[PDB]
Design a protein around this ligand. Sequence first.
Ligand SMILES: C[C@H]1O[C@@H](O[C@H]2[C@@H](O)C[C@H](O[C@H]3[C@@H](O)C[C@H](O[C@H]4CC[C@@]5(C)[C@H](CC[C@@H]6[C@@H]5CC[C@]5(C)[C@@H](C7=CC(=O)OC7)CC[C@]65O)C4)O[C@@H]3C)O[C@@H]2C)C[C@H](O)[C@@H]1O
Ligand SMILES: *[C@@H]1O[C@H](CO)[C@@H](O[C@@H]2O[C@H](CO)[C@@H](O)[C@H](O)[C@H]2NC(C)=O)[C@H](O)[C@H]1NC(C)=O
Ligand SMILES: *[C@@H]1O[C@H](CO)[C@@H](O[C@@H]2O[C@H](CO)[C@@H](O)[C@H](O)[C@H]2NC(C)=O)[C@H](O)[C@H]1NC(C)=O
Ligand SMILES: CC(C)CCC[C@@H](C)[C@H]1CC[C@H]2[C@@H]3CC=C4C[C@@H](O)CC[C@]4(C)[C@H]3CC[C@]12C
Ligand SMILES: CC(C)CCC[C@@H](C)[C@H]1CC[C@H]2[C@@H]3CC=C4C[C@@H](O)CC[C@]4(C)[C@H]3CC[C@]12C
Ligand SMILES: *[C@@H]1O[C@H](CO)[C@@H](O)[C@H](O)[C@H]1NC(C)=O
Ligand SMILES: [Mg+2]
Ligand SMILES: [Mg+2]
Ligand code: NA
Lengths: 996, 32, 291
Amino acid sequence: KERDMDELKKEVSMDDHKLSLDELHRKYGTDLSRGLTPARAAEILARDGPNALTPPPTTPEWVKFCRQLFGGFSMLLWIGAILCFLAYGIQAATEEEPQNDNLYLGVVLSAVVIITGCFSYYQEAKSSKIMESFKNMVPQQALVIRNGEKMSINAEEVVVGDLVEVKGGDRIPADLRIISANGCKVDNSSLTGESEPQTRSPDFTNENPLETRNIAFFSTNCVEGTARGIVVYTGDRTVMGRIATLASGLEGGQTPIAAEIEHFIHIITGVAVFLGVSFFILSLILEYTWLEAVIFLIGIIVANVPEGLLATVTVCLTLTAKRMARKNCLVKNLEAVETLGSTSTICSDKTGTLTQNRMTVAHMWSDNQIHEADTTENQSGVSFDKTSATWLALSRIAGLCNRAVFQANQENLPILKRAVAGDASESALLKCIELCCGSVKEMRERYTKIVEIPFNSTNKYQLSIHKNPNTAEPRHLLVMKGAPERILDRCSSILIHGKEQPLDEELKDAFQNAYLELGGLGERVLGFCHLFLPDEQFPEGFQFDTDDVNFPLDNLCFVGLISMIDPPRAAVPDAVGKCRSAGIKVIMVTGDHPITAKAIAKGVGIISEGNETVEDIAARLNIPVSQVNPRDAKACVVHGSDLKDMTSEQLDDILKYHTEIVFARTSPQQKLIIVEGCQRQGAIVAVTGDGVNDSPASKKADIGVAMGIAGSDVSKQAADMILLDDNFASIVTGVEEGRLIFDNLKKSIAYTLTSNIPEITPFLIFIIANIPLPLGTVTILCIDLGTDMVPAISLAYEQAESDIMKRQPRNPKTDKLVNEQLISMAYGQIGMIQALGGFFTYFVILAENGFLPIHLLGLRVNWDDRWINDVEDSYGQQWTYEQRKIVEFTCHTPFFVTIVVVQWADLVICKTRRNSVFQQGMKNKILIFGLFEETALAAFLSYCPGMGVALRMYPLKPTWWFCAFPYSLLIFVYDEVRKLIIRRRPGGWVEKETYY
Amino acid sequence: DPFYYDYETVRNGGLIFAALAFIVGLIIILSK
Amino acid sequence: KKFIWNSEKKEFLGRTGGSWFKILLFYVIFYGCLAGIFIGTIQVMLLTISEFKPTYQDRVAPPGLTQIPQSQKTEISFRPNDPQSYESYVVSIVRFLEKYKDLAQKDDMIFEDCGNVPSELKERGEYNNERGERKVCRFRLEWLGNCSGLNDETYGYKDGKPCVIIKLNRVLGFKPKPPKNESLETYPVMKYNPYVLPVHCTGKRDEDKEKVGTMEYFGLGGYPGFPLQYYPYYGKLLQPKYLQPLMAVQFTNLTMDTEIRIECKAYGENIGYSEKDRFQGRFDVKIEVKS
Ligand SMILES: C[C@H]1O[C@@H](O[C@H]2[C@@H](O)C[C@H](O[C@H]3[C@@H](O)C[C@H](O[C@H]4CC[C@@]5(C)[C@H](CC[C@@H]6[C@@H]5CC[C@]5(C)[C@@H](C7=CC(=O)OC7)CC[C@]65O)C4)O[C@@H]3C)O[C@@H]2C)C[C@H](O)[C@@H]1O
Ligand SMILES: *[C@@H]1O[C@H](CO)[C@@H](O[C@@H]2O[C@H](CO)[C@@H](O)[C@H](O)[C@H]2NC(C)=O)[C@H](O)[C@H]1NC(C)=O
Ligand SMILES: *[C@@H]1O[C@H](CO)[C@@H](O[C@@H]2O[C@H](CO)[C@@H](O)[C@H](O)[C@H]2NC(C)=O)[C@H](O)[C@H]1NC(C)=O
Ligand SMILES: CC(C)CCC[C@@H](C)[C@H]1CC[C@H]2[C@@H]3CC=C4C[C@@H](O)CC[C@]4(C)[C@H]3CC[C@]12C
Ligand SMILES: CC(C)CCC[C@@H](C)[C@H]1CC[C@H]2[C@@H]3CC=C4C[C@@H](O)CC[C@]4(C)[C@H]3CC[C@]12C
Ligand SMILES: *[C@@H]1O[C@H](CO)[C@@H](O)[C@H](O)[C@H]1NC(C)=O
Ligand SMILES: [Mg+2]
Ligand SMILES: [Mg+2]
Ligand code: NA
């Protein structure tokens, strides 16, 4: 019945917050100013569980070890091993003196799967280990009022229905129902996604508990002020608790790379069973009984299984993952590194992921001119002109009249990431003055504050009077700040380049239009003014006791406006542009206000400059929005209030007809709905988030991208990729590597798939022509698991033949990893030439030793026999058993060498899919060593003292090393001219049939 | 006799070549 | 998604008709060129070898020593009474010696009477074709006494005390060199050390050597070996219907109903041995005349 549980969790949350104080206290049975008695608290403590989310489901290490021994590729090698032991049992019990080939091969295949499992498991475990070193869970205590007394206890020791007080800086313990607040502003950024610090009022405001102000939430931190509240939800029942539990209980899906592996195996086994079955029937038609035919069937089918391709593909993915870890782009999954390259739609989170999630001074209005300060996360943008007296006055008003200061350890920290105490706005102002105005320490103590006036609840304004230490005027300096609509009512003078002017409407109206520019831009504006008090009417000894009119509220001198907003990260704009260049649909998904989300989207690249929304067209035409046609607007903003009242078809239409979509005010569950809707299109979706709301979206997506520091722990665990550096450009690096390794994998696969033809064809003609075995099993193992390992791995180091960040995302149903073109090239043409070269070397060796190639027909009947020591060759000679068998093994060895020789040119041609060998060039040093090591290793396997005794690999006469050279040259020439025609004729014959 | 092949010299040369090409490849991946 | 068989827009098994024809034609021409290339190179390879001599002859350095009853495991198990028990042996013996009858060697243009006494080697010029088809020295069945007879179509052989002739592996240009007169303990043999390749049989351990009581050898003129007048061999092309020397070995005093091992080792300087090939130089047999 877990289906019903997950379904009841996918629904949006509900509440009873909208209740009178008497009704809430009667429902919960709790005093309003004293809470409850401690015995009652302990009774609820041992009633439902401590206030802490139940730990995640522990994953034992033996479970995931066995997991890495299975899947799809490893499963194929497993059935191969099982078939080896099956054929071995049939050969053991049925015939005299059976051979131990199938048994050697069975144990070897089993070992391959086990070793690959150990390697892959060690990699995934390494990533999980460095991830465990990131849990910096600091036990935080809550301030609870019980029995009429305040006490700080463990957050787990908190229960339902009791008074809880929170101070500005304290994290909200559990979900509270605000009962009495005083200037309280909480941060709901990690949960609902609201950027600016949302205030919390005890009075019920919105039907939606997320938008209301009388509710404190789990994992939300009180920015400023103090507040009181009764605990309504506790533990997992909390909002973020149900969110985390939902994220853990969601499906992960099938990665595109794994699906491609499945398709590859389908074709491999398809042709394997076709050849095995048709040859089984052929063998029974010839003369072989059911026994021998079954053995041949298993041999042919298992031979068509790339034994070494598992490890090579795994190591390829591991190498790319290594590069991901070097750039602090960790992947918890070994194959999630590829998912970026297959992505075609990125559902990004705004606050925290796209933006820096921090209020920062954006623009200023000085001398009737707008000045854009540097808003990057590391200070690398343009700086304004800081040389005018207007800027000095404005910066002094900001640095002096503000309730923001640094702390004790804020020394060796940058001006941005350092900690500030007080309001978020005041923190932004303090950082801007500490950055573009020198420092604020000596700047604030130089003007000793006499009397201050903090911000008022109504008719907002913040002012203060300071002493002026200038060596020209001893008059007092009065400063004030506030909302522009509040400062325009308390001003008459205007500052311009140093001198004052009246409040002339010719420039005052310009001030209003500039205010509308900054406000309509999704920013919060604040006006700053100051005035010199007449020292003749207020001497240097008079104290301006704050009770009556001692400061001229009007006739002040306004200097300029100072706006602020959460800016996007540094490489975020460029990165977004890159993703749109690669052909990826960037969709913003957030629960923030639309007025800010639209501006941020225009600022990052999700909304192009020129495109208009469905509302923008009507606004431009001064007509109702119901008149315009949605097809005329390429972009659209979707409000969460309207998203709840939607069907699947409507969302499908929204996505299909609108290229730039901005989902705003979306609940966490609705974020999951957005991701599922994008997945219904059949495309690959990637979700980049940070808050707890992005946990289900990152879990259900094909790949979740979380921030290493600015992201909540829940969404960081439910994601598949972590950015320890929080650099969004890593997404771009990701989509580059995914496609890169994908294409390289194609190459690396084709290579190993090419050697299968010369590995099986000797046995096939051994069955047809009844000639001695041209290629033994041990030599085949020396090829698949010996020499070709380094060339196949070096093929993963291949670079981009063209700009991959220019092409569109691969289509899932069209661009498959392994298609008929790849098989037509490897199994059809190249592997064929390699097989012919092997047979050439075979016939050459046998004919030169006295067995003419024509004389070998039907000779296996007397060859495989161990007692016929007088087999007549072509020159009338009588060959004993071990003599001709020595020739057969000294024929298997150069056959293997021949395979290496053709693999030289095969590696070179597979290195370049479309470009030429001369275009790409042998710059891949790892590949060069692949050829050198492969060649030297083959030579060692043939000439080491005792190879013919241990591996039955007898030494070779030097002429055999040249028996395959023309075949390799021909392979290289044919594939080179093929690529040449692919270049000159990018039409269809040489491109749609061979280019794989 | 023409029925005797100096397999020892060929094997020796094969081993020398197998060592030279391998160490040269090691120098290849080490561009310094 | 696996019913891509056909459609009204022309597709068969996955692709159209015109595409199937284009691909089939390309593969036919491609594979035709590949086959022609393999055939041309294999022809060049055929032109690099001669017709009168194999290029490499080192893999047959130590000559073998085979027998007439090509047993399944070099074992001779039969019944001295049941004629069908030893039919598989006699059949192969008669088929082997069918080319040694006096009627088979009747043409004087291809056969040459070597002699009743083993003489020196007979070198008939070089291995080229400048000379005509060389002559082959005759070897009548009468040389193998007590194991040839003048029987009918079926060679009535020995039921009790069987016969097992040995044969030296025919090798082109091989000149047998018997051991020097300084024989390093070669198991009593005749003093005809210079013109015959000796072959001596024995048991294998203290048990087999005791069970096998007496052995009688038969050869050209009565010598246990191969005469040098029949060597060297000049290939099947220049010497067709060639008859290599034969030498019979009979085990008179055997312990019936007991499997005993016999090792017939051929001695000589140009005769090597091998611990891996029990047939190179030496020869093994497991006789068991169960009554
Ligand atoms: C009754 C009658 O019996 C008479 O004896 C006969 C009779 O029993 C029939 C008997 O046939 C055997 C023999 O040909 C050997 C033959 O090996 C082939 C299949 C079995 C082996 C083990 C082998 C090496 C190669 C090996 C296959 C088994 C399959 C392989 C592992 C396969 C691979 C799979 C892979 O993944 O990589 C390669 C390709 C080929 C392969 O490498 C090749 O398997 C056959 C089943 O031969 C005997 C000599 C005597 C007398 O006449 C008497 O009266
Ligand atoms: C071949 O077999 C015959 C038997 O058919 C052997 O002839 C016997 O020889 C012994 C001496 O060894 C005589 O005492 C017997 O009288 C002979 N019997 C007959 C019927 O002739 C003959 O010895 C055998 N030949 C060899 C070389 O062993
Ligand atoms: C042939 O072998 C037999 C043994 O099968 C020999 O005769 C035996 O001699 C021992 C004494 O050494 C006696 O104890 C046995 O009773 C004898 N058995 C038979 C059946 O006679 C015989 O001497 C051997 N003959 C030759 C010529 O080697
Ligand atoms: C039967 C076969 C071997 C003959 C085919 C001719 C081949 C071997 C010749 C024909 C044209 C030649 C190429 C012509 C073009 C290029 C680009 C140039 O900037 C460097 C030389 C290079 C890389 C040549 C290499 C050898 C080449 C491919
Ligand atoms: C196409 C070219 C550039 C590749 C360069 C590698 C070629 C030239 C090398 C690689 C392996 C080499 C062979 C290595 C082993 C043997 C055995 C040795 O005792 C004699 C030399 C001989 C017969 C070599 C001949 C040259 C050879 C084929
Ligand atoms: C070998 O030596 C013996 C005497 O020891 C002698 O009778 C015989 O003729 C010699 N044979 C040869 C070929 O020298
Ligand atoms: Mg293979
Ligand atoms: Mg966020
Ligand atoms: Na996932």
